[PDB]
Amino acid sequence: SRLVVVSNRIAPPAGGLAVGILGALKAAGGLWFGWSGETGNEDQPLKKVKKGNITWASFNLSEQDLDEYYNQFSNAVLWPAFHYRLDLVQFQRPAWDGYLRVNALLADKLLPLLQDDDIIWIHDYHLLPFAHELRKRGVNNRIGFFLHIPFPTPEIFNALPTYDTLLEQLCDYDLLGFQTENDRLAFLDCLSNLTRVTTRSAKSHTAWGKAFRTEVYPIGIEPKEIAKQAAGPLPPKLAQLKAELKNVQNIFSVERLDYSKGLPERFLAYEALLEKYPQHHGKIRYTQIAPTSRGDVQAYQDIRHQLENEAGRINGKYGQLGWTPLYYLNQHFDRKLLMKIFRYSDVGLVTPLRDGMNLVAKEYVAAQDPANPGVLVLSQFAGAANELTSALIVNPYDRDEVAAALDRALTMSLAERISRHAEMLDVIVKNDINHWQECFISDLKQIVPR
Amino acid sequence: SRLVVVSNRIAPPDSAGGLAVGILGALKAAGGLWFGWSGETGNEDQPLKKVKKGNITWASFNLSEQDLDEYYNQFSNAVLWPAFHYRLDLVQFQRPAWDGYLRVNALLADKLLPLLQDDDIIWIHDYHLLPFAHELRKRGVNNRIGFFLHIPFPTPEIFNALPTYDTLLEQLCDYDLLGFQTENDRLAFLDCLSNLTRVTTRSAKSHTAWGKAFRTEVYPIGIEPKEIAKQAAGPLPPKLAQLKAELKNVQNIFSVERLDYSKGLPERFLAYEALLEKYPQHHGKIRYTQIAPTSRGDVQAYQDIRHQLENEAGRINGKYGQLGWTPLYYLNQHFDRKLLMKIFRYSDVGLVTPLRDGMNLVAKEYVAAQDPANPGVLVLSQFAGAANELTSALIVNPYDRDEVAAALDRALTMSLAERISRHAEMLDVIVKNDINHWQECFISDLKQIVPR
Ligand SMILES: O=c1ccn([C@@H]2O[C@H](COP(=O)(O)OP(=O)(O)O[C@H]3O[C@H](CO)[C@@H](O)[C@H](O)[C@H]3F)[C@@H](O)[C@H]2O)c(=O)[nH]1
Ligand SMILES: O=c1ccn([C@@H]2O[C@H](COP(=O)(O)OP(=O)(O)O[C@H]3O[C@H](CO)[C@@H](O)[C@H](O)[C@H]3F)[C@@H](O)[C@H]2O)c(=O)[nH]1
Numbered sequence: 001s002r003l004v005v006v007s008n009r010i011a012p013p014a015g016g017l018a019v020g021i022l023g024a025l026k027a028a029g030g031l032w033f034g035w036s037g038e039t040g041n042e043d044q045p046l047k048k049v050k051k052g053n054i055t056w057a058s059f060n061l062s063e064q065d066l067d068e069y070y071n072q073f074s075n076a077v078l079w080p081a082f083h084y085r086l087d088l089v090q091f092q093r094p095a096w097d098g099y100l101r102v103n104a105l106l107a108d109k110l111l112p113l114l115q116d117d118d119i120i121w122i123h124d125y126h127l128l129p130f131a132h133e134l135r136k137r138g139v140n141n142r143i144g145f146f147l148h149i150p151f152p153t154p155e156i157f158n159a160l161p162t163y164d165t166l167l168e169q170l171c172d173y174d175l176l177g178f179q180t181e182n183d184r185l186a187f188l189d190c191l192s193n194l195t196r197v198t199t200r201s202a203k204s205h206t207a208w209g210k211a212f213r214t215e216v217y218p219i220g221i222e223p224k225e226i227a228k229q230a231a232g233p234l235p236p237k238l239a240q241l242k243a244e245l246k247n248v249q250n251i252f253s254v255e256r257l258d259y260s261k262g263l264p265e266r267f268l269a270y271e272a273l274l275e276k277y278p279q280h281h282g283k284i285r286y287t288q289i290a291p292t293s294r295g296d297v298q299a300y301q302d303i304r305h306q307l308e309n310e311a312g313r314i315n316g317k318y319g320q321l322g323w324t325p326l327y328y329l330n331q332h333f334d335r336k337l338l339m340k341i342f343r344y345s346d347v348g349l350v351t352p353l354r355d356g357m358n359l360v361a362k363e364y365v366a367a368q369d370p371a372n373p374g375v376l377v378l379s380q381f382a383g384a385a386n387e388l389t390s391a392l393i394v395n396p397y398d399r400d401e402v403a404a405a406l407d408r409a410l411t412m413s414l415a416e417r418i419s420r421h422a423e424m425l426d427v428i429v430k431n432d433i434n435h436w437q438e439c440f441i442s443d444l445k446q447i448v449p450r
Numbered sequence: 451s452r453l454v455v456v457s458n459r460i461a462p463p464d465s466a467g468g469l470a471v472g473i474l475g476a477l478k479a480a481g482g483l484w485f486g487w488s489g490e491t492g493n494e495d496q497p498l499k500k501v502k503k504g505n506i507t508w509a510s511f512n513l514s515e516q517d518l519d520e521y522y523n524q525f526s527n528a529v530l531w532p533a534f535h536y537r538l539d540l541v542q543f544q545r546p547a548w549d550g551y552l553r554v555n556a557l558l559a560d561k562l563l564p565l566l567q568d569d570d571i572i573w574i575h576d577y578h579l580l581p582f583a584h585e586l587r588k589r590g591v592n593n594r595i596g597f598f599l600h601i602p603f604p605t606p607e608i609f610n611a612l613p614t615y616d617t618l619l620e621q622l623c624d625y626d627l628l629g630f631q632t633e634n635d636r637l638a639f640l641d642c643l644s645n646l647t648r649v650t651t652r653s654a655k656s657h658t659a660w661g662k663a664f665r666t667e668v669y670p671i672g673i674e675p676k677e678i679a680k681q682a683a684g685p686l687p688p689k690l691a692q693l694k695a696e697l698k699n700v701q702n703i704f705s706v707e708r709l710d711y712s713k714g715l716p717e718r719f720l721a722y723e724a725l726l727e728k729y730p731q732h733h734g735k736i737r738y739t740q741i742a743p744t745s746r747g748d749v750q751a752y753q754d755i756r757h758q759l760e761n762e763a764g765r766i767n768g769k770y771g772q773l774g775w776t777p778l779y780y781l782n783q784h785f786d787r788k789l790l791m792k793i794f795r796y797s798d799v800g801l802v803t804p805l806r807d808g809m810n811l812v813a814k815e816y817v818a819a820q821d822p823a824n825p826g827v828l829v830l831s832q833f834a835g836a837a838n839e840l841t842s843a844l845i846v847n848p849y850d851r852d853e854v855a856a857a858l859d860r861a862l863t864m865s866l867a868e869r870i871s872r873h874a875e876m877l878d879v880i881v882k883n884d885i886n887h888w889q890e891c892f893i894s895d896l897k898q899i900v901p902r
Contacts, residue, residue, distance in 0.1 A: 237734075237773070237774055238773060238774070240774060241773055241774030287773065305761065307764065307768075308760075308761045308762075308763075308764030308768060309757065309761045309764060310760075310764070311763070311764035311767065311768070312759070312760030312761060312762070312763035312780060313760045313782075315763065315764075315779075315780060315781075316742075316760060316763070316780050316781060316782035316783070317782060317783075319779060319780070319781050320781070321690065321693060321739060321779070321781070321793070322689070322690075322693040322696070324776045327767075327771060327773070327776060328764060328767065328768050328771075329767075329768060329771055329772075329773070330765075330768035330769060331768075331771075341773070
């Protein structure tokens, strides 16, 4: 029976999430409903396009709906709160209202597209209230939810002025999917603090008489397509650089420029490597790629400027006439080129302060030449650390521990690099993006609808 | 006869800078004494530290932490330095700083007095010691005393903002001879003096104010061209020889100075940005290296400009950098002067664009250091005192970042014939007015004065 996916952004006629949604839709046949974000004329029909099994369908938002829904409540209350940064939340009631109003707009426009024996799969924190809004319009359907980001423990979550409403609305889903067991446990603990919840099958619950199930589905990667892209011919100037850096090892990071990512702390870790391991001077380099994300907002502009300052400071202290220790690039690179960069790099530095999963970590390992692989240094606060147990796991709050991991990665024998890489690769191959989506859809299909 | 020189720092035998070679040439001809602050804080009780080699004696004292803060960090570097560099917005006048400034000048005069002899000629250097002739006169010293100001002297509209400008002018007139880097500095001093009090002037350079006789003169400081050429032609240290060879297909734009707000370093970085933006043919084929050792890092305005500069390095490299190409190499590090001559030689462009500079020896070093048969190009701010004499440089206005960018492009593509012609003309000017000439003229003029 049909699959209806809804997600805040979509891609028409790719990246980690899109390939999982596309696979679920290919097997079932369906429709992918979401925003096509450029505002300006909300009052037109849905922009519909069709392949064969599936139809994309998109809508626009007013500049008020966008400021209050996405720029304010999603990106400046939920995003900071869920990544353990209450000091960064910017709660204002007109923004909570706008959040509900937009979830209600989206539900009005989705109602007519739905059919009775459909299955519905909602994605991420922008749409916490969405199932509630569907139940109010009479849709009884199997609806599942997947949260891509962390779910915070009670002491953090309960600080949100509207936490009790958010919890009530989330129990309108039949299935709630999370990246890790601790996220699933945190949600249940928040729920248990507000109201009595009855459990009976490890993962089948009741609360306020509403029935639902929880489960862990750690999002994954397409390892064959990554390996293919990574292995392809370097564009000329990158072939030049690789043969120029024969004796220089490369430590590489890429991510969206976001405060969850701990980029300043990462620069400090590299500084500590340079400070305490002078053997490496002139023979390593750290390259951070960090394109500007949501630069319209103060917390993000603050980190960009801090990174500029820190690149300058660190290079100014440790640099030489013929050696720049830190390459900081505030630029977007194509996913395909990045896979090649991962392969040619010697160490992958993925140390966010808090991350739902972090695909870069999985991508980095998939892209390696398995005969000569690089080493993953990974933060224990990334959700990928629960499975990538053979990465060098570190606490980014201890810059010297991060530095010692980097030193160890830089000196690691081929035998140990193979052993560690092959162990992580086996794990990402077995829980691949195809596996992720199939597990969630099969669980969702099992639920008897109300 | 015997020369006594005082300056805020001195240099005992065991890395000789530009001013130091001038002073030493002076002292080696006359014999004499070099007296000044040791650079050390603490233990000011203990005797003067004296060393002697042949004809010369070096003598230093320590200062107390409070003396240093008020006299050096505050008044010298937070009032006089920003005011004389046309930065009223950075002056931090407070009365305790001024009293400290006078207290330290008096103290140095007290420590110097027992060491003087009747026939000594006395040469005082720089803005730290504006009151020093005055302190010497009230201690009964009748000797010929000359002053040289190494930095610009600002016009009345700026100088007169200093709450103590009047006392400064009165004290400067107790020198028998006052020397300046440029004619505009000399004139600005005289203009300030004429606005306070009636000055009688004969033949442009001989003056009376308040019944006190003194002379003024211009002595643009220079370099030792033959020593620089020797140093510059010497082999690079192996790691740097390797580097020069690896950069065959890369033109180097080079700059070096103290990390000071007078030097216009952010405006310079902005000019390089404009080069990279508007002249993309240079991408991957040029490099701009800025050497900028921290200077006076206890002073708030200096920490500010350092943080501003770091931000701009990161921003610019963040925007124009590539995986295999960093456009801007910023090094907050001191380099030995001898090594720098060699780096100037292998470089293709010298970028010296201060917002205000008494002279700027780096500009003169740069030209002297070039291979005259394959010379680099100097891009020079019209606001360095050096621009008065380095007329064949590519002269630019740093307030117009696109003009600086165009001069960098012009420098990067200049034919060998034009580079030789410009270089030879500049080199001739700096050979005819070298550091030996500078000190010999100052000393000759000072011996001429009839002591009170
Ligand atoms: O310049 C660039 C920069 C990045 N990329 C790609 O962006 C993706 C980054 O995904 P990643 O999961 O590591 O981080 P994230 O952006 O926070 O997404 C959230 O959602 C993810 C999905 O569940 C979850 O893993 C994560 O913890 C969430 F916070 C990854 O596929 C990169 O290759 C790129 O193509 N070019
Ligand atoms: O890392 C480094 C950085 C610099 N140097 C050397 O320091 C000297 C800088 O002298 P320069 O005259 O260019 O500037 P400045 O520091 O302001 O000195 C003042 O006084 C100078 C003398 O009258 C006058 O030209 C100037 O306008 C005044 F502001 C020059 O000889 C460089 O080669 C170095 O050896 N290592």
